[PDB]
């Protein structure tokens, strides 16, 4: 699935009052049980990157964001191999779990999908 | 070109009998107004990137469906954005320019991946000609800043996205924008610009930081890719006689396989060198230049001496025949410039953005031999000669030798 | 809607054709001749180009110096070019300097001295031109392309001619060439811009009335070429950019497939990494090439002659290890003109061409060149309404049928210049002219 | 140093009480005498390549067995080839120099693979310092040719093997060679040079093509690698007072973590900039330079103004204290220059080759406040100021601003 | 075997009057029967080049000698694949069979062998 898809569906849910009332609390619990914050990751660090679109989005990260992501990946890898969890400031707090990558990938995919559409235009 | 005003924007159009229309937005945003070096080149290259209503991709794909074309260039005075299309497609092009001026998303990736690399290839292609380099170097020596700023973006001084965004905030404003329509019905254009450019900021007139100051000097750009030499003379009072003098002195041949009958053309006999005199009016100052390119530094040096002699000889005496030849060559140069869409747009752009009424080719003044010789005399007796040498600079002349 | 092209004849059979534009102040008048290098044999190859030099070297009245002065005094310029099938001599001037320019052109064509002293002087100038074309890579590539595609035939010869001929061209053979070929029924006097047709016809009656007529007047643009699939490799490891042309036999001016070949050419189109918009073009080949950095540029062409043509592409690339991919992807895009093109590509290319054919004519010299080319190749100026109708008649079936007989599984002429080690041998290139999956 | 002559070669040696000797061949072959730009640098780098008796490889391997070292450099006046070894190994080193001058095989592969790449790294290392670049640029403006030739080989002007072989045919000759031995018994050296350099060509004295001419001007070298500015003043009559003035104006601090009490040092306060006044005597002309480097072009500009003021202020009045401080700092500079083997060799080399008798540090003249102020006055009021700016040149000062 | 060896042994033979009187005529017939001149080669074109020393010597050839060698190799390869021999000006005449490469390889090998010797020096 494309990030575009995921974001659009999420926005449909967040619009509907009923839907958001039942989905938002579930989603927050899911994230708590997922436990990626206990390895000091932000959610976007987990997105599959071995794709042309994602490699292009990662190249467009500002250098600071890019250097910080590299450190979180190395740090999480060291927790993984040691079978330890983050403690203290290494744990990602909910307020730090920012969608730093989502805007870049949405722009990459926007162009990719427009190109697909326009490759199939029919002069009327 | 019937000059009018539509929603605070100056619009000039001339209807014709052709299926082809040219619409140009002329912006007061050339390099003399550049906040940081190279920003006006970068802004020019940022035109027709992603806007909020329409992506660069979507624009290009739709332009191909109309068979339209896009031309952009930067001068010392303006940025010119020109589109060429079929007459009927005028509303689309007006709306496209509106999107560019109102709603360009200046995104960092566009700067890094699209805009800056294209600007760099643009410059490298220009510099392949050593005469381009020599004439650019000469303006830099003569004016230092303002007119002396580089027109093009260079690698040594990088333009940032914040630099370009700030400059665009100044330039993309009703006070700095003129619309020029060749083969466009003038009433129709006013109606469309009046609806499309209504919500553009008013802004303020962009100005040159500091007054134009003239300086003499030397520039020695060592390259390995050809040889050239400009001899420029900064002019404090731009006068129309220098056009006649540039055309008189001449340099290029008017005939295949020939040298030419112009004094500067005759200076190149026995050498594989070319020469060209040019005069650049910038309103408040001017530059009279003679550029010589060739493969041999020895031959360039030889011609350079003959060139300065030619100018001195002209300051002595011009014949009536020669003065008439100057009037003819100058009227012709004026006419073809008003025809060429690139130069045309900037000419009316200057009339609209400043207030300098265009001199019609049919109204080009005839200068007597007295007036021409007097103009050449002032140049031969300049306190501030500029000499820009490009190539094997150890073998090219110096100002004090000339 | 552009003004109507007026056309008149003289008694000798000289055509006068004009298109006025009351919005400009300059005018281009000149003489388009249905004659060029292809009219020479092997012994006098180079003559037509030699004459072009001597035409500006002095006439029976004005000497070389007087000629220079006369043009300088007019204010505009004169220009000339000789091609394989066409020679042009024109003068751009001011509106009211048109009678002077017609008089000078008439003089240099009819009454040129061709003085042994001047022949001998130019004989060195032209000899130096042989060693300096070497730099204009596009021209080097296209001249080798003609030489190989039309091997040992008149269209295969160069315009400059061999060094041997340059040393042996006499004033006699120069005079003979221009007497046989520059005849009134092969010539068109063209005016564009600020010209009056009736004024131009009067000037033609004054200056070009004593032109010889040919014994057997055929119509303008009257011609057998046998294309050779073949290759020229000019490998030069020291050059950084490879230049490659690939062509098949194309269409003549008067072919029934002339518009179909132009539409097919527009489906592939052009590309240049230096232009900002080129990364966003709709052409499939454009997308492949730009995404993978395969080339600095490519330019599709469809060159026509009276009885044949060449249709193909010219590529430039610094990517010397992926030349194979570049050639592979280009020829697989050509395959798709036979196997896959539909109304989608065809209607998009037609849209782009309907404008393109009109956009090209944006100045008096372009207009004059268009009137002159069309009058000397078709015998008439084709109105934009007729052109719009012929383009509209092109269907996807026409493009597929044309590509299946012209491109699919056909021999190519191929020229490579520069670091072309990665360009495979002829068979592997020619094998991409078909698809085993189809 | 006892000056003598051995088989037509000028030999100067001074015995000492140390186990280490320095033997230096000084050649009249520096860049002012160069025939092609960069050849004197290339010839310097071609020393101790393959000779007919001994390969470069064999020389280096044997030099390591003696624990000797090899030092070479090019100036505007000389090429200096120095070896440092134990006293007793003198005969080997004399013979090695003889092989280099008589029997160097100048092979094309040595030029392409060994000599030219090393010459290129040499230059790039020097240019890492923008002050080096600025002072080099200043000499080029001031003298144009001769002293204005580049010292070092550059990529834009390729030296060929035929260029180097021709120059070496001139330079490697008894008339252009001086031998200088530090801590070498003078009688022993004369005996060895007399046998080893007997079959060297006599040749003729190398001369500067053209007389030294002085010029003013500006050089503007755009780098992205730091900022510097030289303010030079060409001197037509070199006088020893300019040494005292250079040391007086000073610039570098004479103690750690301090600014210094010199007028130019005090000009840098509040800035991370350094300054250095220098005087270069070249016999027939001279150059007085003040070089300022820093990271900020704004700060450089600020200091540059203060620097020119300092020079004008000196032209007004110097106190008795200040004149004595100048004598002290100048005697010291002279002493340490005669001590350093690098500069020592060229000092006696200039006495032996040219004929300019050396001025012993103990005989350095004391200049009165009158004489110092007069020298500074003569510099502030020069008709030909040179200014070389390196770095962000759009932000550095111009000559007319100073 | 090294080119150095071959050259030195040859020089011993050429020195000895007796030896040269008997070896030089044989060597000339050998070269005639070898037949490399009939493919337009010069003798040195045949020397094995896939060694560090030979690669270095070939890099030191002057550009014109290098471009001519490339042409002779391509031309000989085309004769070989066509099963034809050179005719006319393509046949190498004895006066054109110059040892263009021998001086370069002798210098490369001289240094290589000196380096080997000096790697085995013993301070006495």
PDB file of N, CA and C in Angstrom, chain D residues 121-183:
ATOM      1  N   UNK D 121      50.782  18.932  -6.649  1.00  0.00           N
ATOM      2  CA  UNK D 121      50.450  18.807  -5.241  1.00  0.00           C
ATOM      3  C   UNK D 121      51.137  19.902  -4.432  1.00  0.00           C
ATOM      4  N   UNK D 122      52.348  20.286  -4.852  1.00  0.00           N
ATOM      5  CA  UNK D 122      53.114  21.336  -4.203  1.00  0.00           C
ATOM      6  C   UNK D 122      52.305  22.628  -4.234  1.00  0.00           C
ATOM      7  N   UNK D 123      51.788  22.965  -5.422  1.00  0.00           N
ATOM      8  CA  UNK D 123      51.041  24.196  -5.591  1.00  0.00           C
ATOM      9  C   UNK D 123      49.752  24.156  -4.783  1.00  0.00           C
ATOM     10  N   UNK D 124      49.021  23.040  -4.857  1.00  0.00           N
ATOM     11  CA  UNK D 124      47.742  22.957  -4.173  1.00  0.00           C
ATOM     12  C   UNK D 124      47.916  23.102  -2.668  1.00  0.00           C
ATOM     13  N   UNK D 125      49.042  22.610  -2.141  1.00  0.00           N
ATOM     14  CA  UNK D 125      49.272  22.741  -0.716  1.00  0.00           C
ATOM     15  C   UNK D 125      49.511  24.203  -0.347  1.00  0.00           C
ATOM     16  N   UNK D 126      50.238  24.928  -1.196  1.00  0.00           N
ATOM     17  CA  UNK D 126      50.532  26.327  -0.932  1.00  0.00           C
ATOM     18  C   UNK D 126      49.277  27.190  -0.998  1.00  0.00           C
ATOM     19  N   UNK D 127      48.405  26.865  -1.944  1.00  0.00           N
ATOM     20  CA  UNK D 127      47.241  27.679  -2.220  1.00  0.00           C
ATOM     21  C   UNK D 127      46.162  27.440  -1.172  1.00  0.00           C
ATOM     22  N   UNK D 128      46.333  26.410  -0.338  1.00  0.00           N
ATOM     23  CA  UNK D 128      45.376  26.175   0.731  1.00  0.00           C
ATOM     24  C   UNK D 128      45.310  27.411   1.630  1.00  0.00           C
ATOM     25  N   UNK D 129      46.444  28.117   1.726  1.00  0.00           N
ATOM     26  CA  UNK D 129      46.539  29.396   2.408  1.00  0.00           C
ATOM     27  C   UNK D 129      46.148  30.521   1.451  1.00  0.00           C
ATOM     28  N   UNK D 130      45.016  31.231   1.662  1.00  0.00           N
ATOM     29  CA  UNK D 130      44.614  32.315   0.761  1.00  0.00           C
ATOM     30  C   UNK D 130      45.582  33.499   0.764  1.00  0.00           C
ATOM     31  N   UNK D 131      46.398  33.626   1.814  1.00  0.00           N
ATOM     32  CA  UNK D 131      47.365  34.711   1.867  1.00  0.00           C
ATOM     33  C   UNK D 131      48.502  34.487   0.872  1.00  0.00           C
ATOM     34  N   UNK D 132      48.839  33.215   0.616  1.00  0.00           N
ATOM     35  CA  UNK D 132      49.874  32.868  -0.339  1.00  0.00           C
ATOM     36  C   UNK D 132      49.400  33.316  -1.720  1.00  0.00           C
ATOM     37  N   UNK D 133      48.168  32.925  -2.036  1.00  0.00           N
ATOM     38  CA  UNK D 133      47.526  33.290  -3.284  1.00  0.00           C
ATOM     39  C   UNK D 133      47.512  34.805  -3.470  1.00  0.00           C
ATOM     40  N   UNK D 134      47.130  35.556  -2.424  1.00  0.00           N
ATOM     41  CA  UNK D 134      47.023  37.008  -2.512  1.00  0.00           C
ATOM     42  C   UNK D 134      48.386  37.627  -2.781  1.00  0.00           C
ATOM     43  N   UNK D 135      49.430  37.111  -2.137  1.00  0.00           N
ATOM     44  CA  UNK D 135      50.718  37.752  -2.346  1.00  0.00           C
ATOM     45  C   UNK D 135      51.299  37.401  -3.717  1.00  0.00           C
ATOM     46  N   UNK D 136      50.959  36.210  -4.219  1.00  0.00           N
ATOM     47  CA  UNK D 136      51.390  35.812  -5.550  1.00  0.00           C
ATOM     48  C   UNK D 136      50.666  36.657  -6.590  1.00  0.00           C
ATOM     49  N   UNK D 137      49.350  36.836  -6.400  1.00  0.00           N
ATOM     50  CA  UNK D 137      48.546  37.637  -7.311  1.00  0.00           C
ATOM     51  C   UNK D 137      49.092  39.061  -7.372  1.00  0.00           C
ATOM     52  N   UNK D 138      49.550  39.574  -6.219  1.00  0.00           N
ATOM     53  CA  UNK D 138      50.019  40.948  -6.133  1.00  0.00           C
ATOM     54  C   UNK D 138      51.295  41.118  -6.943  1.00  0.00           C
ATOM     55  N   UNK D 139      52.189  40.128  -6.906  1.00  0.00           N
ATOM     56  CA  UNK D 139      53.390  40.267  -7.708  1.00  0.00           C
ATOM     57  C   UNK D 139      53.064  40.238  -9.191  1.00  0.00           C
ATOM     58  N   UNK D 140      51.970  39.568  -9.553  1.00  0.00           N
ATOM     59  CA  UNK D 140      51.683  39.371 -10.962  1.00  0.00           C
ATOM     60  C   UNK D 140      51.173  40.686 -11.538  1.00  0.00           C
ATOM     61  N   UNK D 141      50.334  41.380 -10.761  1.00  0.00           N
ATOM     62  CA  UNK D 141      49.817  42.691 -11.113  1.00  0.00           C
ATOM     63  C   UNK D 141      50.941  43.723 -11.143  1.00  0.00           C
ATOM     64  N   UNK D 142      51.867  43.629 -10.192  1.00  0.00           N
ATOM     65  CA  UNK D 142      52.817  44.708 -10.010  1.00  0.00           C
ATOM     66  C   UNK D 142      53.886  44.655 -11.091  1.00  0.00           C
ATOM     67  N   UNK D 143      54.246  43.450 -11.546  1.00  0.00           N
ATOM     68  CA  UNK D 143      55.407  43.354 -12.415  1.00  0.00           C
ATOM     69  C   UNK D 143      55.061  42.819 -13.800  1.00  0.00           C
ATOM     70  N   UNK D 144      53.910  42.146 -13.927  1.00  0.00           N
ATOM     71  CA  UNK D 144      53.453  41.500 -15.158  1.00  0.00           C
ATOM     72  C   UNK D 144      54.327  40.328 -15.604  1.00  0.00           C
ATOM     73  N   UNK D 145      55.578  40.590 -15.979  1.00  0.00           N
ATOM     74  CA  UNK D 145      56.465  39.531 -16.429  1.00  0.00           C
ATOM     75  C   UNK D 145      57.691  39.571 -15.533  1.00  0.00           C
ATOM     76  N   UNK D 146      58.668  38.690 -15.780  1.00  0.00           N
ATOM     77  CA  UNK D 146      59.866  38.629 -14.957  1.00  0.00           C
ATOM     78  C   UNK D 146      59.515  38.257 -13.521  1.00  0.00           C
ATOM     79  N   UNK D 147      59.561  39.254 -12.630  1.00  0.00           N
ATOM     80  CA  UNK D 147      59.132  39.079 -11.256  1.00  0.00           C
ATOM     81  C   UNK D 147      57.643  38.805 -11.213  1.00  0.00           C
ATOM     82  N   UNK D 148      56.944  39.121 -12.306  1.00  0.00           N
ATOM     83  CA  UNK D 148      55.514  38.913 -12.281  1.00  0.00           C
ATOM     84  C   UNK D 148      55.142  37.519 -12.778  1.00  0.00           C
ATOM     85  N   UNK D 149      56.106  36.758 -13.322  1.00  0.00           N
ATOM     86  CA  UNK D 149      55.807  35.383 -13.715  1.00  0.00           C
ATOM     87  C   UNK D 149      55.421  34.567 -12.487  1.00  0.00           C
ATOM     88  N   UNK D 150      54.541  33.576 -12.664  1.00  0.00           N
ATOM     89  CA  UNK D 150      54.220  32.686 -11.566  1.00  0.00           C
ATOM     90  C   UNK D 150      55.458  31.891 -11.182  1.00  0.00           C
ATOM     91  N   UNK D 151      55.604  31.604  -9.888  1.00  0.00           N
ATOM     92  CA  UNK D 151      56.731  30.813  -9.430  1.00  0.00           C
ATOM     93  C   UNK D 151      56.461  29.347  -9.747  1.00  0.00           C
ATOM     94  N   UNK D 152      55.184  28.961  -9.712  1.00  0.00           N
ATOM     95  CA  UNK D 152      54.816  27.555  -9.693  1.00  0.00           C
ATOM     96  C   UNK D 152      54.128  27.219 -10.997  1.00  0.00           C
ATOM     97  N   UNK D 153      54.205  25.939 -11.348  1.00  0.00           N
ATOM     98  CA  UNK D 153      53.560  25.445 -12.545  1.00  0.00           C
ATOM     99  C   UNK D 153      52.052  25.380 -12.328  1.00  0.00           C
ATOM    100  N   UNK D 154      51.304  25.805 -13.344  1.00  0.00           N
ATOM    101  CA  UNK D 154      49.855  25.757 -13.271  1.00  0.00           C
ATOM    102  C   UNK D 154      49.319  24.957 -14.442  1.00  0.00           C
ATOM    103  N   UNK D 155      48.084  24.464 -14.294  1.00  0.00           N
ATOM    104  CA  UNK D 155      47.493  23.514 -15.227  1.00  0.00           C
ATOM    105  C   UNK D 155      47.153  24.160 -16.567  1.00  0.00           C
ATOM    106  N   UNK D 156      46.837  25.446 -16.487  1.00  0.00           N
ATOM    107  CA  UNK D 156      46.418  26.224 -17.633  1.00  0.00           C
ATOM    108  C   UNK D 156      47.568  26.446 -18.616  1.00  0.00           C
ATOM    109  N   UNK D 157      48.818  26.442 -18.126  1.00  0.00           N
ATOM    110  CA  UNK D 157      49.975  26.593 -18.999  1.00  0.00           C
ATOM    111  C   UNK D 157      50.901  25.387 -18.856  1.00  0.00           C
ATOM    112  N   UNK D 158      50.701  24.341 -19.677  1.00  0.00           N
ATOM    113  CA  UNK D 158      51.460  23.102 -19.539  1.00  0.00           C
ATOM    114  C   UNK D 158      52.906  23.262 -19.992  1.00  0.00           C
ATOM    115  N   UNK D 159      53.810  22.818 -19.127  1.00  0.00           N
ATOM    116  CA  UNK D 159      55.230  22.773 -19.443  1.00  0.00           C
ATOM    117  C   UNK D 159      55.519  21.464 -20.169  1.00  0.00           C
ATOM    118  N   UNK D 160      56.263  21.534 -21.274  1.00  0.00           N
ATOM    119  CA  UNK D 160      56.606  20.344 -22.039  1.00  0.00           C
ATOM    120  C   UNK D 160      58.025  19.917 -21.716  1.00  0.00           C
ATOM    121  N   UNK D 161      58.363  18.695 -22.123  1.00  0.00           N
ATOM    122  CA  UNK D 161      59.684  18.174 -21.859  1.00  0.00           C
ATOM    123  C   UNK D 161      60.718  18.969 -22.644  1.00  0.00           C
ATOM    124  N   UNK D 162      60.308  19.574 -23.759  1.00  0.00           N
ATOM    125  CA  UNK D 162      61.284  20.311 -24.539  1.00  0.00           C
ATOM    126  C   UNK D 162      61.593  21.664 -23.903  1.00  0.00           C
ATOM    127  N   UNK D 163      60.553  22.306 -23.352  1.00  0.00           N
ATOM    128  CA  UNK D 163      60.659  23.486 -22.507  1.00  0.00           C
ATOM    129  C   UNK D 163      61.618  23.250 -21.351  1.00  0.00           C
ATOM    130  N   UNK D 164      61.431  22.149 -20.612  1.00  0.00           N
ATOM    131  CA  UNK D 164      62.272  21.937 -19.449  1.00  0.00           C
ATOM    132  C   UNK D 164      63.695  21.616 -19.889  1.00  0.00           C
ATOM    133  N   UNK D 165      63.861  20.873 -20.986  1.00  0.00           N
ATOM    134  CA  UNK D 165      65.200  20.478 -21.396  1.00  0.00           C
ATOM    135  C   UNK D 165      66.010  21.679 -21.878  1.00  0.00           C
ATOM    136  N   UNK D 166      65.333  22.633 -22.534  1.00  0.00           N
ATOM    137  CA  UNK D 166      65.985  23.834 -23.038  1.00  0.00           C
ATOM    138  C   UNK D 166      66.423  24.722 -21.879  1.00  0.00           C
ATOM    139  N   UNK D 167      65.505  24.940 -20.933  1.00  0.00           N
ATOM    140  CA  UNK D 167      65.812  25.754 -19.776  1.00  0.00           C
ATOM    141  C   UNK D 167      66.976  25.150 -18.998  1.00  0.00           C
ATOM    142  N   UNK D 168      66.961  23.829 -18.810  1.00  0.00           N
ATOM    143  CA  UNK D 168      68.045  23.179 -18.092  1.00  0.00           C
ATOM    144  C   UNK D 168      69.379  23.312 -18.825  1.00  0.00           C
ATOM    145  N   UNK D 169      69.347  23.434 -20.164  1.00  0.00           N
ATOM    146  CA  UNK D 169      70.566  23.577 -20.954  1.00  0.00           C
ATOM    147  C   UNK D 169      71.213  24.923 -20.651  1.00  0.00           C
ATOM    148  N   UNK D 170      70.382  25.945 -20.427  1.00  0.00           N
ATOM    149  CA  UNK D 170      70.848  27.251 -19.990  1.00  0.00           C
ATOM    150  C   UNK D 170      71.298  27.252 -18.525  1.00  0.00           C
ATOM    151  N   UNK D 171      70.469  26.719 -17.627  1.00  0.00           N
ATOM    152  CA  UNK D 171      70.660  26.911 -16.203  1.00  0.00           C
ATOM    153  C   UNK D 171      71.773  25.990 -15.714  1.00  0.00           C
ATOM    154  N   UNK D 172      71.807  24.744 -16.179  1.00  0.00           N
ATOM    155  CA  UNK D 172      72.782  23.854 -15.577  1.00  0.00           C
ATOM    156  C   UNK D 172      74.153  24.090 -16.206  1.00  0.00           C
ATOM    157  N   UNK D 173      74.825  25.188 -15.840  1.00  0.00           N
ATOM    158  CA  UNK D 173      76.054  25.636 -16.486  1.00  0.00           C
ATOM    159  C   UNK D 173      76.893  26.347 -15.432  1.00  0.00           C
ATOM    160  N   UNK D 174      78.228  26.327 -15.548  1.00  0.00           N
ATOM    161  CA  UNK D 174      79.098  26.903 -14.528  1.00  0.00           C
ATOM    162  C   UNK D 174      78.751  28.353 -14.205  1.00  0.00           C
ATOM    163  N   UNK D 175      78.148  29.070 -15.154  1.00  0.00           N
ATOM    164  CA  UNK D 175      77.888  30.488 -14.969  1.00  0.00           C
ATOM    165  C   UNK D 175      76.649  30.722 -14.114  1.00  0.00           C
ATOM    166  N   UNK D 176      75.868  29.672 -13.863  1.00  0.00           N
ATOM    167  CA  UNK D 176      74.605  29.907 -13.188  1.00  0.00           C
ATOM    168  C   UNK D 176      74.538  29.105 -11.897  1.00  0.00           C
ATOM    169  N   UNK D 177      75.681  28.592 -11.444  1.00  0.00           N
ATOM    170  CA  UNK D 177      75.704  27.641 -10.350  1.00  0.00           C
ATOM    171  C   UNK D 177      76.604  28.197  -9.262  1.00  0.00           C
ATOM    172  N   UNK D 178      76.100  28.191  -8.022  1.00  0.00           N
ATOM    173  CA  UNK D 178      76.901  28.460  -6.838  1.00  0.00           C
ATOM    174  C   UNK D 178      76.729  27.324  -5.834  1.00  0.00           C
ATOM    175  N   UNK D 179      77.834  26.901  -5.222  1.00  0.00           N
ATOM    176  CA  UNK D 179      77.795  25.865  -4.207  1.00  0.00           C
ATOM    177  C   UNK D 179      78.001  26.509  -2.838  1.00  0.00           C
ATOM    178  N   UNK D 180      77.097  26.228  -1.881  1.00  0.00           N
ATOM    179  CA  UNK D 180      77.141  26.784  -0.531  1.00  0.00           C
ATOM    180  C   UNK D 180      77.142  25.658   0.497  1.00  0.00           C
ATOM    181  N   UNK D 181      78.211  25.595   1.299  1.00  0.00           N
ATOM    182  CA  UNK D 181      78.388  24.563   2.308  1.00  0.00           C
ATOM    183  C   UNK D 181      78.356  25.115   3.734  1.00  0.00           C
ATOM    184  N   UNK D 182      77.284  24.804   4.465  1.00  0.00           N
ATOM    185  CA  UNK D 182      77.187  25.063   5.890  1.00  0.00           C
ATOM    186  C   UNK D 182      77.766  23.909   6.715  1.00  0.00           C
ATOM    187  N   UNK D 183      78.763  24.204   7.571  1.00  0.00           N
ATOM    188  CA  UNK D 183      79.468  23.241   8.425  1.00  0.00           C
ATOM    189  C   UNK D 183      80.244  22.253   7.554  1.00  0.00           C
TER     190      UNK D 183
END
